[PDB]
Design a protein around this ligand. Structure first.
Ligand SMILES: *[C@@H]1O[C@H](CO)[C@@H](O[C@@H]2O[C@H](CO)[C@@H](O)[C@H](O)[C@H]2NC(C)=O)[C@H](O)[C@H]1NC(C)=O
Ligand SMILES: *[C@@H]1O[C@H](CO)[C@@H](O[C@@H]2O[C@H](CO)[C@@H](O)[C@H](O)[C@H]2NC(C)=O)[C@H](O)[C@H]1NC(C)=O
Ligand SMILES: *[C@@H]1O[C@H](CO)[C@@H](O)[C@H](O)[C@H]1NC(C)=O
Ligand SMILES: *[C@@H]1O[C@H](CO)[C@@H](O)[C@H](O)[C@H]1NC(C)=O
Ligand SMILES: *[C@@H]1O[C@H](CO)[C@@H](O)[C@H](O)[C@H]1NC(C)=O
Ligand SMILES: *[C@@H]1O[C@H](CO)[C@@H](O)[C@H](O)[C@H]1NC(C)=O
Lengths: 895, 895
């Protein structure tokens, strides 16, 4: 009991604002029970259980209301799981639910979740304040009212003029008390929870007493219709005062004299007056009867279904139905959902005290889920126990006029009906104070967060971290709810924002799990990404079922703040401008890429090309750029690399020429790529600073496309020829792919197009998925469109049949069967150059005239004295072919 | 006349499909008039002008219909401008409107515009086919029908069973004729346009004749209500056959005997029968009268407004209103808009013949705009001339039963009413043939385009480039329209897709102008980007006014194909996977950046940091990485660069260690950056391959943050010390900014946080916006939060007052006034080291104990013998300060 009372000395249900965020940057105990569960359980129980639940039980029945509760509950339990994965991730920063969402989903969604929830909570201030004024005018003080109806038809207008003149009278009282008396209202958090849960138990007490003996609450009927028990007290058409039968006051309101003359309406005279039991209790058979629907229309008299009546009097000449019971408004299914829904909102109060718990990764998930479960078990068992204990004709009655102006709920209370009427009053007064505290701290947090700059003046707090300007704005948005002055119309507008916040909380947690954003570790047990997606579609549907023409103005206001933060998100970090909106998406996509493996399933060539630029700078071989567009036509990353010699301190105007000749040239041949002009000491280094440092992030170059040294055996170019030899060993170590083009100047540019073409591919042993795919990418292009693919295979085994039967089943698996297959078969440098000249005879004698020849490029020797052991081997390999492309690679897979 | 008839030998209104796209890749005259204008003018005039316009004129009046036409017209004229900017851009490829949109907006939107337009046109096939069957059962052959009403109440059911049994009977006839007889229906394009425009002129002929003498079309009334003139011929209650007055057949349908006994309904007997003129003409005063609204309800008898009647008989005991004129359906404003809208669709037929025009950048814009203008001028002047010439009670009449079963339009025809009835029949038959040709060529184009892979089997054309499988699918989507069997319900579903296509065509052209996508040159005269945006919101609103619960199923089907193409767009080019969806957005954002200038308005430091990694590799100074997070905290690009020595062929396992030590370290201090580990010959080169080649695209590094050589005067490190000196001259030439950190090991890491801190800034002459902003970024961080900013200025002039009054007005402009200001003032190497030791005395004697000191770093000498002329100058400058950061930069501006 000791940790109870000491914890009850701590227990306050208020959010932790930015003053509690200051104590987190400068650097007690709680529990699961008084920390999350009891704050959340208070902020869900509200006015709708007491003031408008029984009105929904009788109208929609119990079979449609059970389906109605189970779809409004099931959104909250799924968006608690999306509040759970935010809790398990992160370190749960001290201060509010705003800082828990904003830090774990970035400032992108946090300014939009935090701002829908500001307006959604401010209308919960004005809705509860209309809840208190309605109780004050119907049950507590139904005498005191300024505006009174000047006729029998002014009940529509004078009632709404009551709700405007007391709301604005009390909203100024509510705003000042939370302003000056913050320390007092901090103390009464246990009073308000005591008033609620006793009032809920007082219902469940009296439902058990009514099973054994129901109370005395009779109702009076007149044919099928009932009548207001306001003016008269006794229900009889004739008062039998002994030997003198007297006209009652029931006679007086209908018949236009209190005399025995019988000069009145024919519907009163032909129909008798019946007084039966209005609350027959749990022993009664109501559940088989009161089950389906009673969807009335505004003006229709509420009529008991199963009574014998007399069918006449088509008009309604009863002094505007002076003594009867009516329907206030027309009603249907998808209107009540806007009224029921704010009874299930308050999950975000589950983490008002995250900076005081000790196990915040376990209290915040398990606490709200248990709080939703104990609340939905009340709601569902309230709906049935309202149905099977109370006659439906008073359940269709707002304001309890059929039971002589007492609360429809409060007549089911065992001690007294003044218990719930007072008990729901200090409840709804208290959740009005809480809503004028939880909302001004929130706008205080967003304003000091700097996340949206035009809301900057609302950060001006007072001396103790309490606001002064957000109160005056939240007093003027509660003000708009009070001018509407109608509990049934504030409720769908209020519901439209709390649906919108739970729309985003399910949205961002489903996206960031799928795309694998950085720093996203939902370490929760019972979680998936579809489970946030399923709740995302569900409270998309509820948002239109309320009112579709308000759901579009709710999205496109929230969808425009989400884009307004990003346009200010760019202009702070990325310098300025609409360029920064593209810089950030460039950065954020690259940081996404850092997790996955490179080799995953599939291979595509991503070209690194490197050109030679001479003196009076320009490219020497534009046909090499012309090849690049013929493979990777309007596709992945292209890096046009180039080098030149020495002293960047005075060589950069040459770099300006060198880059600009390439930029206008890629546009000339439709290459969408990126230029790198590097100034090195020798060309040996400057090529190797691009084979390993081209393309940051995941967008690495994957192949290297290079020409051929044509000035091979000449004066000094040997070391430039030696730079080619170090390039081959480099790509094997770095695990790239090499593409070597021979006779570069005679290549098909984009004017020349070929016809009757044949490409001849010689796939001997190695490089399967790259030597096969390279013509298939080329043929795909319009220049190489009208061409033929020929694949010739060298063999070294004995059988060729199964060798072809192994080869012919590759194409069926590759789905590119259109190539024709033909089999062929037959100190250290000479053995290399024995088979060189022999095979090159076999190459030409079946492929003298192709438009392009493909060959395997073998591995260079590790000796490094193999300049002449290996390169005459390749010039014999290029035995006077017109266009041959050499290829080798390492460590890849092609599907 | 010669180019007419020869052009009339060419004039065919069919789209150019993929066979016309083959003739563009292998590689006559037209004009504006027969090329764009007349094809577009045919495919807008349809069934709605003849069959359901007059029904809308009488119901919605002429004041609401004029506002109705002017908002459905104004969407088409704005989406023609968005079709104009697609035309002026590009080269206008041969073949259809699909290839014009797909190439100019990429395969992203082209598969979604091209697929909404496929379904939007297929229902235009089934709508027109219901238009022909309705004319065939009401005017031409109203005798032949299989299903006939078994009672007076079967007219609802038997009519819809007529439309199902003839539609599917004729849809098989429509599908085969376009299959086998493509050459025949190619010839009749001039017949169908001749049938339309003569029928439109036959209306405007007879409206002029009716002004001088209206024809004879009388109608019969009975009190306020009219009656069907079907069975009887003469309108009198008593046939006066001489001396024997006889009961008419008008008597026979009402009164239940053709005898003179008068045994019948009291509404017939108390009310007289009036036969007035049903079409009073242009001379009549109808326009002041027939103006407002007549929104009826299903079952209500159409009643003339201004007639004297007799008010009795509450029920309708007239053998289910056997002889009367009714309303087929309930109606309101936002239901008729779904019926009127397909009268204005057909813009995409403006470029069916783009591959045959000569000036395709001028014919396509000016042709469709003139085609919309001449069509809207018909529609608006048809609405008024229908109102002010025809009595409203037959305008509320479908099927023309009040005028004895003749067309409400066709009675305004001057030669004969059989002109329009035949003329609108060969029109609507012809636009049904055209819709079963324009739609199967379209799905043939998307299937061969490979843009969506599950639609691949629909590319199987026949031998002459004509489809065979897209016809059977478009016969089965017309089939669903025929089972609905109702012209009033196919029309909003048909309207929902053509609105969706014009939604995207306005969308993509407004986006790609704003973001400046590559290759987007709208060279059109009268164009802006808001003018596409204004039309985008307008046919967003029309899409909900039709039916909101169909607009959400129209977007989220089109919005899901747009994301399905991209997930196949990634898995083709970027290897595979959901990584490729991020690679493409990374590439596409960088290619956007290539246009704009760098220096635009604002400056932010984008750090290039470079570290020293020793033997048994690890970073030597982790405190330098600790500084990076304290400036650019969770913000722009960070490049952690590193070098090591020699022979990448065998040095890459050292590179694996070198990169991995940095990756776990940036996470340890919350740095979101990118690693580059470069292996060079000397460290002189390998630093300079990062100062100019770090960060492709727009995301360049903008500053360089570097430590300090502490082993200054020692054994061999002179040349490594000389590598620092070449780094300073390099950044001045490359126009970067330099940040030099002194005493690197004693820096505040993220555990240690400071209090009572002072940062002392010495801004002497140069580097304004960088030396001011650098503490302001630091203070912003939590470690440097509780600190003070002190700015001390060295002076060389005489006055200091106005010098402070120039300095104190900077802070008011910078809004960072919180710093305190204090003024101070007072072979070749010695003059540099005279003022060095003098100023460094002045530095320390006001700033002995700051947490960080900022100083201007001067320019190095061009002599290059200034190793000792300049670096003792800096070590005297660092006169035993704890933490000082040196800074200089070039060519920037800070706002
Ligand atoms: C209550 O009684 C009346 C007659 O006493 C029932 O009959 C209906 O009366 C209205 C007149 O307001 C008529 O329009 C309906 O056609 C009557 N319905 C019939 C004859 O079936 C009325 O239904 C009763 N109310 C109930 C059962 O809820
Ligand atoms: C046509 O005549 C009738 C009476 O002959 C007009 O009067 C209405 O009659 C209906 C009965 O179906 C009543 O429900 C309405 O209350 C009557 N309206 C009155 C009396 O104003 C009827 O308005 C006439 N139709 C017109 C003018 O369009
Ligand atoms: C109505 O009844 C009263 C009896 O209370 C009588 O005084 C009065 O005269 C009667 N009025 C008549 C019969 O008009
Ligand atoms: C009302 O009920 C009583 C039974 O006490 C009966 O005598 C009377 O006739 C009824 N009146 C009616 C049906 O109008
Ligand atoms: C109705 O009038 C006819 C005259 O055509 C007459 O033959 C018949 O007897 C009459 N029926 C009566 C009066 O019931
Ligand atoms: C119908 O009009 C005629 C005028 O020819 C008149 O004699 C007759 O009384 C009218 N009938 C009515 C108003 O029922």
């Amino acid at each position: 009991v000791s940790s109870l009372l000491s914890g009850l000395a701590n227990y306050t249900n208020l959010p932790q604002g930015s003053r509690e965020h200051e104590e987190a940057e400068n650097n007690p105990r709680m529990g699961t029970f008084m920390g999350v569960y009891l704050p959340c359980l208070q902020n869900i129980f509200g006015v709708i259980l007491f003031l408008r639940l029984t009105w929904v039980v009788g109208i929609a029945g119990i079979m449609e209301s059970f389906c109605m509760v189970f779809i409004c509950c099931s959104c909250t339990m799924l968006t608690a799981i999306s509040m759970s994965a935010i809790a398990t991730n992160g370190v749960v920063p001290a201060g509010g639910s705003y800082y828990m969402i904003s830090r774990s989903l970035g400032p992108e969604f946090g300014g939009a979740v935090g701002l829908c929830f500001y307006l959604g909570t401010t209308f919960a201030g004005a809705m509860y304040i209309l809840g208190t004024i309605e109780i004050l005018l119907a049950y507590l003080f139904p005498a005191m009212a300024i505006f009174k109806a000047e006729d029998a038809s002014g009940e529509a207008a004078a009632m709404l003029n009551n709700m405007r003149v007391y709301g604005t009278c009390v909203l100024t009282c509510m705003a000042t008390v939370v302003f000056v008396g913050v320390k007092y209202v901090n103390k009464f958090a246990l009073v308000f929870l005591g008033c609620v849960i006793l009032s809920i138990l007082a219902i469940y007490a009296g439902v058990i007493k009514s099973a054994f003996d129901p109370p005395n609450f009779p109702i009076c009927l007149l044919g099928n219709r009932t009548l207001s028990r306001h003016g008269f007290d006794v229900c009889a058409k004739l008062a039998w005062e002994g030997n003198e039968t007297v006209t009652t006051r029931l006679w007086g309101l209908f018949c236009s004299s209190r005399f025995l003359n019988a000069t009145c309406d024919e519907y009163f005279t032909r129909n008798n007056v019946t007084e039966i039991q209005g609350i027959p209790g749990a022993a009664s058979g109501l559940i088989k009867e009161n089950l389906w629907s009673s969807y009335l229309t505004k003006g229709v008299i509420v009529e008991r279904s199963g009574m014998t009546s007399v069918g006449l009097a088509d008009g309604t000449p009863i002094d505007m139905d002076h003594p009867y019971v009516f329907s206030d408004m027309t009603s249907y299914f998808t209107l009540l959902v806007g009224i029921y829904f704010p009874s299930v909102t308050g999950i975000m109060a589950g983490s008002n005290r995250s900076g005081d718990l000790r196990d915040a990764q376990k209290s915040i998930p398990t606490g709200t889920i248990l709080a939703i479960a104990t609340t939905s078990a009340v709601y569902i068992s309230s709906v049935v126990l309202f149905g099977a204990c109370i006659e439906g004709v008073v359940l269709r009655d707002k304001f309890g006029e059929a039971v002589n102006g007492n609360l429809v709920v409060g007549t089911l209370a065992w001690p007294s009906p003044w218990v719930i009427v007072i008990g729901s009053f200090f409840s709804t007064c208290g959740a009005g104070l809480q809503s004028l505290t939880g909302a001004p701290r929130l706008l205080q947090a967003i304003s000091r967060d700097g996340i949206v700059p035009f809301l900057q003046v609302f950060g001006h707090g007072k001396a103790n971290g309490e606001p002064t300007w957000a109160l005056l704005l939240t007093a003027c948005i509660c003000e708009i709810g009070i001018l509407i002055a109608s509990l049934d119309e504030v409720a769908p507008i209020l519901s439209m924002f709390f649906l919108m916040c739970y729309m985003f909380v399910n949205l961002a947690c489903a996206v960031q799990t799928l795309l694998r954003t950085p720093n996203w570790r939902p370490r929760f047990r019972y979680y998936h990404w579809t489970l946030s997606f399923l709740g995302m579609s569900l409270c998309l549907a509820l948002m239109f079922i309320c009112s579709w023409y308000y759901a579009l103005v709710a999205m496109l206001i929230a969808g425009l703040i989400y884009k307004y933060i990003e346009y200010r998100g760019a202009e702070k970090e990325w310098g300025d401008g609409i360029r920064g909106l593209s810089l950030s998406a460039a950065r954020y996509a690259l940081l996404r890429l850092e997790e996955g493996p490179p080799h995953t399933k599939n291979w595509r060539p991503q070209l690194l090309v490197l050109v030679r630029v001479d003196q009076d700078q320009n490219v020497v071989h534009p046909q090499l750029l012309s090849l690049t567009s013929q493979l990777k036509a309007g596709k992945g990353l292209t890096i046009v690399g180039s080098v030149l010699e020495g002293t960047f301190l005075e060589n950069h105007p040459q770099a300006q020429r060198a880059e600009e000749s390439i930029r206008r040239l890629m546009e000339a041949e439709k290459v969408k790529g990126f230029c790198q002009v590097v100034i090195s000491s020798n060309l040996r280094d400057g090529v190797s600073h691009l084979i390993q440092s081209g393309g940051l992030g995941g967008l690495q170059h994957n192949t290297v496309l290079v020409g051929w040294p044509r000035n091979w055996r000449q004066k000094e170019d040997h070391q430039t020829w030696r730079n080619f030899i170090e390039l081959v060993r480099e790509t094997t170590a770095g695990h790239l792919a090499l593409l070597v083009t021979k006779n570069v100047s005679m290549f098909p540019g984009n004017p020349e197009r070929f016809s009757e073409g044949s490409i001849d591919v010689w796939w001997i042993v190695h490089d399967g998925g790259m030597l096969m795919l390279l013509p298939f990418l080329l043929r795909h292009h319009k220049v190489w469109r009208k061409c033929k693919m020929r694949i010739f295979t060298v063999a070294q085994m004995d059988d060729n049949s199964i060798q072809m039967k192994k080869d012919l089943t590759t194409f069926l698996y590759h789905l590119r069967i259109t190539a024709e297959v033909e089999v062929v078969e037959m100190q250290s440098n000479v053995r290399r150059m024995h088979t060189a000249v022999r095979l090159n005879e076999v190459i030409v004698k079946k492929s003298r005239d192709a438009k392009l020849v493909l060959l395997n490029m073998p591995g260079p020797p590790r000796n490094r004295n193999g300049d002449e052991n290996y390169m005459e081997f390749l010039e014999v390999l290029t035995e006077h072919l017109d266009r041959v492309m050499l290829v080798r690679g390492g460590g890849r897979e092609v599907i």
